[PDB]
Amino acid sequence: IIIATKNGKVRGMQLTVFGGTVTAFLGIPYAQPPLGRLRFKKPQSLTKWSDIWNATKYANSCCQNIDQSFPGFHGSEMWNPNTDLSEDCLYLNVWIPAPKPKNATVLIWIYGGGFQTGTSSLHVYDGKFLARVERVIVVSMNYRVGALGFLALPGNPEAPGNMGLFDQQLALQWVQKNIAAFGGNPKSVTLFGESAGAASVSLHLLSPGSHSLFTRAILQSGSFNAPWAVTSLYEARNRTLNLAKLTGCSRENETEIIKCLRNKDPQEILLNEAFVVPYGTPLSVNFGPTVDGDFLTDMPDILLELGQFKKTQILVGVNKDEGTAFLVYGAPGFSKDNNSIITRKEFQEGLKIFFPGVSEFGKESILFHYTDWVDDQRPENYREALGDVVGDYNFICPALEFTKKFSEWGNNAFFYYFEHRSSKLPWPEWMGVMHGYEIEFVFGLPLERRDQYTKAEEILSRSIVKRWANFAKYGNPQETQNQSTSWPVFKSTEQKYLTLNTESTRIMTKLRAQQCRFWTSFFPKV
Ligand SMILES: *[C@@H]1O[C@H](CO[C@@H]2O[C@@H](C)[C@@H](O)[C@@H](O)[C@@H]2O)[C@@H](O[C@@H]2O[C@H](CO)[C@@H](O)[C@H](O)[C@H]2NC(C)=O)[C@H](O)[C@H]1NC(C)=O
Ligand SMILES: *[C@@H]1O[C@H](CO[C@@H]2O[C@@H](C)[C@@H](O)[C@@H](O)[C@@H]2O)[C@@H](O[C@@H]2O[C@H](CO)[C@@H](O)[C@H](O)[C@H]2NC(C)=O)[C@H](O)[C@H]1NC(C)=O
Ligand SMILES: *[C@@H]1O[C@H](CO[C@@H]2O[C@@H](C)[C@@H](O)[C@@H](O)[C@@H]2O)[C@@H](O[C@@H]2O[C@H](CO)[C@@H](O)[C@H](O)[C@H]2NC(C)=O)[C@H](O)[C@H]1NC(C)=O
Ligand SMILES: O[C@H](CNCC1CC1)[C@H](Cc1ccccc1)NC1c2ccccc2-c2ccccc21
Ligand SMILES: *[C@@H]1O[C@H](CO[C@@H]2O[C@@H](C)[C@@H](O)[C@@H](O)[C@@H]2O)[C@@H](O)[C@H](O)[C@H]1NC(C)=O
Ligand SMILES: CC(=O)N[C@H]1[C@H]([C@H](O)[C@H](O)CO)O[C@@](O)(C(=O)O)C[C@@H]1O
Ligand SMILES: *[C@@H]1O[C@H](CO)[C@@H](O)[C@H](O)[C@H]1NC(C)=O
Ligand SMILES: *[C@@H]1O[C@H](CO)[C@@H](O)[C@H](O)[C@H]1NC(C)=O
């Protein structure tokens, strides 16, 4: 099956999914390759081609550093890129149902990875199940990460910043111009992403250039007001200058530096990205979004607080154990290969790792709020406390605060709390319901009866997929049929949220209330 797009014909391939068929278009280009003089610049528009572009395999992933902490371990390596790294990486994928739909709701995925890593070709991002089961069209794109996607000299178009966000945006534009030819409805587009993907989604709700490119938004374990999500104009300059010094590209003509950095191999630039931060943490975002004055006209907390954003429905949520994944990438006494019972002194040293530039008093205050023990004798007390600290500060409390702020301007919001630990999850049991391990269920992998998921997980994925699709299609994430628990809207007074798990789906109120008052009211003062 061949589809004419605005720049030429693309050839797809046919997949067999659950005694049915999905048509996949893998690796459609959506921009000029950002090579040569185009490196660091905004994405540029594609010239027409006259042949039939063969979009039958995933394209190159964007250049990025690889996580090497656990060679050969599936828990880490399932996130590493699975196509060639290349600067020539601006491509996207389309999964359309067979038979070709008439006017199908579109779902556009934006992956995470700290704005430094990630790729759409990952196994847990396979959109074929969603196309098959719910008859939506699924789209995902590669966008530039790390310095190549977010190096910033504010105002200088040679490296203005937010390039990777503009990559995402050009891809949203491609869906507006072309998805009708695939049987998709450009007027029913829902963005969803996880982690830095989710924070990207939240920034598309703030960027005026994106408002007409989508209908609704879903934010999984991430939002722009998370402390790791935005780099300051200060740090972006200090980081850019450090990179120039590390590469021997220190000049004075601000442009003669970009020229110099444009003659370096991608590998030299990736080498030096690690040391532009003076003190890194497991959550360091060396090169991320900035207030460029183009994609983002003001500091996003101000836009949020004053209601300057797209008015539409949002779906937001977090996992029970967001913080534990990061503990084994640096904290003392932690190991994925033992139960990581840490002492008080280990805990204290762990705060220095995750809060390097924070005062003695700031760290004491974290210790104080999180070491009032419901039982003071439990040996896991400090191990659990450190994960909760990292998770509440870095994910859970910023997401709650985004949802409160956003819903105060009249729009329906739905909040979930994911607390099912995958039965195939390769990390140890003390790490719990980890960051990123709801994605399997959102994409419907447990629906594959061949895998090792239980029947309970098939049913739970089955409802999540239904709820997500009903949110994309109708702005209302109900499962109206198998007598499901009704998901209430998140109001700033009541703060009702839905818990997702295999046993019992319940309505609760005011998640992590005590913890988030500390992080969102007090801690910003220090
Ligand atoms: C494709 O469907 C659209 C209508 O879909 C709606 O879009 C949003 C308003 C969303 O919020 C939901 O209500 C729906 O999913 C049809 O759009 C029409 O397009 C013509 C121009 O082409 C325009 O003049 C009409 O006003 C549009 N109708 C509406 C209700 O906005 C479109 O006709 C459908 N195309 C098909 C079925 O081929
Ligand atoms: C802003 O940048 C300076 C310079 O960073 C140093 O050089 C880079 C190439 C890279 O290797 C960094 O890791 C270096 O630290 C920072 O100042 C340095 O601070 C460290 C300790 O904090 C000190 O040992 C160095 O001698 C300092 N060098 C210089 C030139 O000042 C500075 O900390 C950065 N951040 C801030 C907030 O100023
Ligand atoms: C859990 O393991 C950590 C990490 O040690 C590594 O993993 C072990 C499973 C084993 O293979 C070690 O040889 C590895 O180096 C332990 O932390 C170490 O503890 C010792 C003494 O307490 C200390 O000298 C080391 O510096 C620590 N290593 C670190 C912090 O990286 C930890 O004690 C183990 N805990 C339990 C409960 O088993
Ligand atoms: O391998 C990172 C975990 N971090 C540690 C840094 C040293 C590599 C993560 C991939 C992963 C691992 C285990 C379980 C689930 C996902 N993906 C990113 C990331 C990559 C590089 C730099 C910063 C970040 C960052 C920052 C905040 C949130 C998420 C992430
Ligand atoms: C594009 O693909 C055309 C048809 O390819 C068919 O499917 C692919 C996946 C292969 O398995 C091939 O053997 C099949 O015939 C080719 O005829 C054409 O040459 C290709 N063009 C380019 C530029 O690759
Ligand atoms: C070093 C190593 O691979 N150790 C063990 C792994 C991992 O520690 C965990 O899966 C989390 O990493 O898990 C087992 O205990 C398990 O119960 O399957 C078997 C294996 O010996
Ligand atoms: C030097 O900087 C100026 C702006 O200050 C710029 O116009 C000029 O092009 C730069 N030099 C070169 C060789 O590009
Ligand atoms: C509802 O239950 C039936 C089994 O009785 C199942 O086949 C179907 O997939 C379920 N639907 C949803 C949306 O969970």
- Could you write out the three-class secondary structure of 438-472? CHHHHHCHHHCCCCCCCHHHHHHHHHHHHHHHHHH
27's enclosing H/E stretch is strand 20-29
520 vs 526: CA distance, rounded Å = 12
Q: Is the CB of 14 under 6 A from ligand 5?
A: no
Catalytic residue among 322, 401, 457, 479: 322
Closest ligand 6 atom, residue 428 Cα: 11
462 vs 135: CA distance, rounded Å = 14
Dihedral (CA of 45, 50, 51, 56) sign: positive
Structure tokens, 114: 């700290």
Structure tokens, 86: 């290349």
Question: Are 72 and 115 a contacting pair, CB within 8 Å?
Answer: no
Give the other-Cβ count within 10 Å of 394's Cβ: 25
Q: Which residues pair with 110 in a beta bridge?
A: 193
Question: Are 15 and 23 a contacting pair, CB within 8 Å?
Answer: yes
Which of 475, 498, 472, 473 minimizes the C-alpha distance to 412?
A: 475
Assign domain 1-526 to its CATH superfamily. Answer: Alpha/Beta hydrolase fold, catalytic domain (3.40.50.1820)
182 vs 49: CA distance, rounded Å = 18
Phi and psi at 507, nearest 5°, equal -95, 130
Closest ligand 6 atom, residue 75 Cα: 12
Structure tokens, 300: 């996003």
* Domain limits, the chain: 1-526
Using alpha carbons, list the distances in angstroms from residue 478 to 169, 312, 460, 463, 492. 29, 17, 14, 9, 20
Q: Is the CB of 478 under 6 A from ligand 8?
A: no
CA gyration radius, the chain = 22
Structure tokens, 325: 């994944």
Ligand nearest, relative to CA of residue 469: 8
116 vs 145: CA distance, rounded Å = 5
Ligand 2-lining residues (CB < 6 angstroms): 238, 242, 245-246, 275, 278
Burial class (CB in 10 A: 0-12, 13-18, 19+), 37: exposed
237 vs 432: CA distance, rounded Å = 38
Distance 338 CA to ligand 6 centre (A): 9
Structure tokens, 344: 């008080």
CA 309 from chain centre, in angstroms, equals: 19
Q: Which residues of 65-83 are buried (b: 16+ CB within 10 A; e: fewer)?
A: beeeebeeeebbeebbbeb
Sheet holding 13-17, edge to edge: 13-17, 20-29, 91-98, 137-141, 104-110, 184-194, 216-220, 314-319, 413-418, 496-500, 507-509
Start-to-end C-alpha separation, the chain: 60
Distance 155 CA to ligand 7 centre (A): 14
Burial class (CB in 10 A: 0-12, 13-18, 19+), 267: exposed
Phi and psi at 216, nearest 5°, equal -140, 175
Q: Is the CB of 253 under 6 A from ligand 7?
A: yes
Q: Which residues pair with 192 in a beta bridge?
A: 109, 218
